[PDB]
Enzyme design. Structure first.
Site, PDB file in Angstrom:
ATOM      1  N   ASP A  21       0.873  -1.190   0.000  1.00  0.00           N
ATOM      2  CA  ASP A  21       0.000   0.000   0.000  1.00  0.00           C
ATOM      3  C   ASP A  21       0.908   1.238   0.000  1.00  0.00           C
ATOM      4  O   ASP A  21       1.382   1.674   1.053  1.00  0.00           O
ATOM      5  CB  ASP A  21      -0.895  -0.065   1.243  1.00  0.00           C
ATOM      6  CG  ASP A  21      -1.889   1.076   1.335  1.00  0.00           C
ATOM      7  OD1 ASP A  21      -1.723   2.085   0.652  1.00  0.00           O
ATOM      8  OD2 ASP A  21      -2.832   0.957   2.141  1.00  0.00           O
ATOM      9  N   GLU A  43       0.979  -3.102  26.968  1.00  0.00           N
ATOM     10  CA  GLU A  43       0.473  -3.016  28.324  1.00  0.00           C
ATOM     11  C   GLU A  43       1.263  -3.895  29.291  1.00  0.00           C
ATOM     12  O   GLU A  43       1.237  -3.646  30.483  1.00  0.00           O
ATOM     13  CB  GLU A  43      -1.047  -3.305  28.397  1.00  0.00           C
ATOM     14  CG  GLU A  43      -1.664  -4.141  27.267  1.00  0.00           C
ATOM     15  CD  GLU A  43      -2.020  -3.331  26.018  1.00  0.00           C
ATOM     16  OE1 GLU A  43      -1.787  -3.833  24.901  1.00  0.00           O
ATOM     17  OE2 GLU A  43      -2.543  -2.202  26.143  1.00  0.00           O
ATOM     18  N   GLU A 101       1.345   2.658  13.051  1.00  0.00           N
ATOM     19  CA  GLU A 101       0.265   2.415  12.099  1.00  0.00           C
ATOM     20  C   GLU A 101      -0.742   1.448  12.761  1.00  0.00           C
ATOM     21  O   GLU A 101      -0.566   0.234  12.774  1.00  0.00           O
ATOM     22  CB  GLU A 101       0.826   1.898  10.778  1.00  0.00           C
ATOM     23  CG  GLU A 101      -0.090   2.142   9.599  1.00  0.00           C
ATOM     24  CD  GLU A 101      -1.272   1.199   9.590  1.00  0.00           C
ATOM     25  OE1 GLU A 101      -2.184   1.367  10.428  1.00  0.00           O
ATOM     26  OE2 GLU A 101      -1.279   0.287   8.752  1.00  0.00           O
ATOM     27  N   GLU A 125     -11.315  -2.937  14.967  1.00  0.00           N
ATOM     28  CA  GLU A 125     -10.132  -3.755  15.290  1.00  0.00           C
ATOM     29  C   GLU A 125      -8.807  -3.003  15.169  1.00  0.00           C
ATOM     30  O   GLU A 125      -7.807  -3.554  14.723  1.00  0.00           O
ATOM     31  CB  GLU A 125     -10.095  -5.001  14.407  1.00  0.00           C
ATOM     32  CG  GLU A 125     -11.327  -5.875  14.533  1.00  0.00           C
ATOM     33  CD  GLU A 125     -11.028  -7.326  14.207  1.00  0.00           C
ATOM     34  OE1 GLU A 125     -10.593  -7.608  13.071  1.00  0.00           O
ATOM     35  OE2 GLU A 125     -11.213  -8.183  15.095  1.00  0.00           O
ATOM     36  N   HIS A 148      -5.429  -0.134   1.265  1.00  0.00           N
ATOM     37  CA  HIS A 148      -5.886  -1.434   1.742  1.00  0.00           C
ATOM     38  C   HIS A 148      -7.068  -1.297   2.705  1.00  0.00           C
ATOM     39  O   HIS A 148      -7.759  -2.254   2.980  1.00  0.00           O
ATOM     40  CB  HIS A 148      -4.739  -2.229   2.352  1.00  0.00           C
ATOM     41  CG  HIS A 148      -4.358  -1.795   3.725  1.00  0.00           C
ATOM     42  ND1 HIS A 148      -3.594  -0.674   3.971  1.00  0.00           N
ATOM     43  CD2 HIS A 148      -4.637  -2.333   4.934  1.00  0.00           C
ATOM     44  CE1 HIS A 148      -3.422  -0.540   5.273  1.00  0.00           C
ATOM     45  NE2 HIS A 148      -4.046  -1.533   5.878  1.00  0.00           N
TER      46      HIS A 148
END
Ligand SMILES: NCC1(CCNC(=O)Nc2ccc3cnccc3c2)CCCCC1
Ligand SMILES: NCC1(CCNC(=O)Nc2ccc3cnccc3c2)CCCCC1
Ligand SMILES: [Cl-]
Ligand SMILES: [Cl-]
Lengths: 299, 299
Positions: free
Chosen positions: B10, B88, B103, B112, B253
């Site tokens: 992409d 985390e 990204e 998601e 994408h």
């Protein structure tokens, strides 16, 4: 729901089953029919329209609930009974059936296919002298030349925005690709590597080895081997039906399966290219030996 | 591996990040950089080439092992440290970082997406006065007219090979579609429904409601509402970078997200079409009110 809509809009797939059933109504008239993995129920409705006495549709998926409503909308609930669960564990309202129909096929025929359930249903429920459709299946390989696409998947990784990513090649090669091939890139005649008659095949038959010879038809760089399958409706048919999922035929939702070669190699028109293929069940894998190297592929 | 290759190819996505980093090297020179969800490591390598003192790449996926080898192939292991796990729960070799790059974006920006991890990293690890990029994001809606495609998804179900399957419409409508739109089918100006500055946004901000008005530009039958997003690199940049994932721009994408209308309705050029949209986190859902009916969509 997505896969069901897609399967329904695959005209080659769905019209082939329709034509088989509607043009050979003698196979269904007054028969007890089992539809293994019935999905939305379409094949069960075809069988009912062709004069089945009773149709049992089985599916483990939640799509079966939609199939219940569909059967009711078409006023077929007195002929078609739907049952949710695996064929291996559901209770049928009969001990035997005259005919089994199923659309069970996966990519490369056997990837994530329901053939094991169909064979189970045959052995447990098919009446002596009954029939299973489609009754005959073949798998074929064909050689491919596509240096541009090979560069897109492989050479690509040597320079990604100025950086080396060569190691990624090893993760790409083992992944079989499902995609429709440009038939102009085919560089051999096909070779059958497997023939299945669903009446006589057992589950152990689905793991197999085959030596093959590809008759090369164009002098070129071989970059991949492609696989596909053909489906036949033959037994007791006056109107036989066949369809191929090969690159020379109208595309289907099964497309073709492509096994990339790590190291492309030159071939000559008229050459007999020899290799060996083995399919194993672990998540099926395909092991290919060609041009003195071997690679195992998965989907 | 598939998604990583796809993301790398992409060009709009990857060149935008590259251009931001390479054309604003002052943001990175001698800085400590955190790459959240680093994948193959490409953004970390961009930051290193732009003069980062230290780059920490974190990812929970097994792709990180490939990233380790890639960093070594490019001789950057003295500048880039990779750490496997969730942001985390991993242990960083520093207490704070100067800059966070990521990204993280999903379909429709938030399906998601890894934004929750980026916001966590900001609050736990970003130095006072540090920066997060991309720093600004927007989401937009636009009206669509495509009666043919509507018929393909909806009217299709009334007659499937001679049988009624009307009930399937109710399973189709709630499923948002991810697909590239023909820009000729757009029938309104876009409307921004959400603006996010990653420096000041919290996780509770990602559930939101917006009234919107779509300025209709063509008299037509409205059959869907489409969504997309724009990404901005702004803070402290001499060379600002933007890209849109909208249907008027080069495809990415992320394509576009399409919310089908159950009942298409007529609109007129110059009309101000008013509605309301709410995004909830349960598996995000999008609730749309338009033309006096309401529908919730999922991906
Ligand atoms: N799923 C989409 C991707 C493309 C897969 N296509 C793909 O690999 N197709 C082909 C077809 C024929 C070939 C013949 N010789 C060599 C290589 C060949 C590759 C691109 C994005 C990453 C994942 C694979
Ligand atoms: N995943 C492939 C399928 C196609 C999804 N495409 C799809 O539904 N695209 C569009 C686009 C614009 C539209 C505008 N107005 C009304 C309907 C529209 C539908 C076909 C096979 C079943 C699953 C959806
Ligand atoms: Cl062929
Ligand atoms: Cl737009």
């Amino acid at each position: 729901y997505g896969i069901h809509e897609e399967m329904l809009k695959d005209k080659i797939r769905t019209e082939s089953y329709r034509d088989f059933i509607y043009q050979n109504p003698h196979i269904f008239k007054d028969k007890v029919v089992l539809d293994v993995g019935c999905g939305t129920g379409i094949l069960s409705m075809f069988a009912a329209k062709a004069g089945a006495k009773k149709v049992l549709g089985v599916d483990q998926s939640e799509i079966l609930y939609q199939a219940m409503d569909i059967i009711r909308l078409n006023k077929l609930e007195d002929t078609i009974t739907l049952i949710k669960g695996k064929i291996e564990e559901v209770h049928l309202p009969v001990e035997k059936v005259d005919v089994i129909i199923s659309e069970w096929m996966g990519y490369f025929l056997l990837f994530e296919s329901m053939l094991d359930s169909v064979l189970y249903a045959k052995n447990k429920y098919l009446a002596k002298g009954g029939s299973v459709y489609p009754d005959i299946c073949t798998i074929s390989l064909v050689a491919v030349s596509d240096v541009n696409k090979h560069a897109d998947r492989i050479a690509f990784w040597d320079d990604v925005y100025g950086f080396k990513m060569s190691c990624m090649k090893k993760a790409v090669i083992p992944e079989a690709v499902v995609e429709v091939l440009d038939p102009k890139t085919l560089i051999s005649e096909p070779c059958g590597i497997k023939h299945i008659d669903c009446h006589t095949t057992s589950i152990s038959d689905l793991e197999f080895s085959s030596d093959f010879t590809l008759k090369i038809t164009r002098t070129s760089m071989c970059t991949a081997i492609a696989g596909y399958f053909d489906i036949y409706f033959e037994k007791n048919c006056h109107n036989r039906v066949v369809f191929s999922t090969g690159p020379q035929s109208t595309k289907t939702h099964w497309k073709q399966t492509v096994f990339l070669l790590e190291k492309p190699f030159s071939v000559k028109a008229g050459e007999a290219l020899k290799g060996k293929v083995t399919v194993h069940k672990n998540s099926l894998t395909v092991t290919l030996t060609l041009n003195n190297s071997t690679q195992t592929y998965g989907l």
